């Protein structure tokens, strides 16, 4: 499970926003600058930016 270091503020409804402390399961994208993770709360999708999170 990855951890959101910086609060990611999404501008659209597609990618969900997460504050500092929310965890998300990484789906794919090992590099680049935009990965997709699935929150473990409501069980929805949340394109998390490669930046703003870190494996921990």
């Amino acid at each position: 499970t990855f951890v959101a270091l910086y609060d990611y503020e999404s501008r659209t409804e597609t990618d969900l926003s997460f504050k500092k402390g929310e965890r998300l399961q990484i789906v794919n994208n090992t590099e680049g600058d935009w990965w997709l993770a699935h929150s473990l709360t409501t069980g929805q999708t949340g394109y998390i930016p490669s930046n703003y999170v870190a494996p921990s």
Partner: peptide, 9 residues
């Protein structure tokens, strides 16, 4: 510091 602003995908 200076969080990397969303690089437009």
């Amino acid at each position: 510091a200076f969080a990397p602003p969303l690089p437009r995908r």
